[PDB]
Amino acid sequence: KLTFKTDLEKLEREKAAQIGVAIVDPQGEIVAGHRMAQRFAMCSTFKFPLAALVFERIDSGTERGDRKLSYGPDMIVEWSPATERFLASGHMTVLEAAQAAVQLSDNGATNLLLREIGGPAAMTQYFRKIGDSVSRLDRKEPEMGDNTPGDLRDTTTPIAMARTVAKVLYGGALTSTSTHTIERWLIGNQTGDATLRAGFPKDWVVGEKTGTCANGGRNDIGFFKAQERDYAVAVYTTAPKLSAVERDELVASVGQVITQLILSTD
Ligand SMILES: *C(=O)/C=C/N[C@@H](C(=O)O)[C@](C)(Cn1cc[n+](C)n1)S(=O)O
């Protein structure tokens, strides 16, 4: 929609921001987009694909969800609330760490999973395995979020990531049970109350994973169900001159622009 494009460009101009958006249907067909194939830093949005990789290994038997991953204080990095709470106990299970990574964006738990799957190269291999030739993880937390201008490390594009989301949730990447679990984790996410879902109607089923990077990166990827119609969505923004609250409001505004499009396309 032309209103969709114009409204996003008005936000970009007035907030000195770039907004990358892709909305795809369950089969990956494009519904709408803006700067869809511009690369943006993934920031913590990769933790959703990371959990998907873990569930695939659980599905295949190469990982077990209740396996205990032991660690010491060396695994604590900034914003590791669950990892800090479980530190005295000495471990988190595979599933606990994945849920912490998805629902709290726990950075220590993310690095703990990376230790167990083979590091950033293994995450990138999983993207390639499910047909995403674009998304790439080059580093662990926190440095993967440095978001140095122009750096192609640790990037994706809105369209590639939206199609990856659709493959994971609708395209058979996971068993029905693992798909349902990761869906519920996304709905129950604790970090997205002020971002995309704040801009969507309150009767839409929404689940998503946020990201924040230095140099003004603020992202939110996931899915929404509007009545019976399911969509996958990826939103990446760069707004160096906005405050953190204003960046939250920007993503929520993008959610409203998406909503106007979806409501009118009926
Ligand atoms: C996912 O997007 C992870 C984000 N990490 C950021 C952030 O939350 O903005 C960190 C935690 C930056 N930060 C904020 C406060 N402190 C002490 N560090 S970091 O891992 O870059």
Task: CATH number of the domain at 116, please.
Answer: 3.40.710.10
**27 CA to middle of ligand 1, Å?**
33
Annotated binding site for a beta-lactam: 47, 105, 141, 212
Query: Which residues, at least 6 apart from 113, have a Cβ–Cβ distance to it below 8 Å?
Result: 50, 54, 69, 94, 97, 98, 101
Q: Is the CA virtual torsion 132, 192, 118, 177 positive or negative? A: negative
**148 CA to middle of ligand 1, Å?**
15
The conformation of residue 61, written as its DSSP 8-state character, comes to T
Residue 245 structural domain: 2-264
The secondary structure of 228-259 as a DSSP string is TEEEEEEEEEE-TTS-HHHHHHHHHHHHHHHH
**133 CA to middle of ligand 1, Å?**
27
Ligand 1, atom nearest to 217 Cα: 2
* In the block, residue with structure tokens 């978001």: 147
Name the experiment that determined this structure: X-ray
**How many domains, in total, are found in the chain?**
1
Residues 189, 210: Cα–Cα separation, whole Å: 9
Other beta carbons less than 10 A from residue 243's beta carbon: 9
Query: Which residues, at least 6 apart from 163, have a Cβ–Cβ distance to it below 8 Å?
Result: 22, 24, 28, 131, 132, 232
Q: Ligand 1: residues whose CB is within 6 Å?
A: 43-44, 78-79, 105, 107, 141-142, 145, 211-212
Ligand 1, atom nearest to 212 Cα: 2
For residue 259, count CB atoms less than 10 angstroms from its CB and return exposed for 0-12, middle for 13-18, buried for 19 or more: middle
For residue 224, count CB atoms less than 10 angstroms from its CB and return exposed for 0-12, middle for 13-18, buried for 19 or more: buried
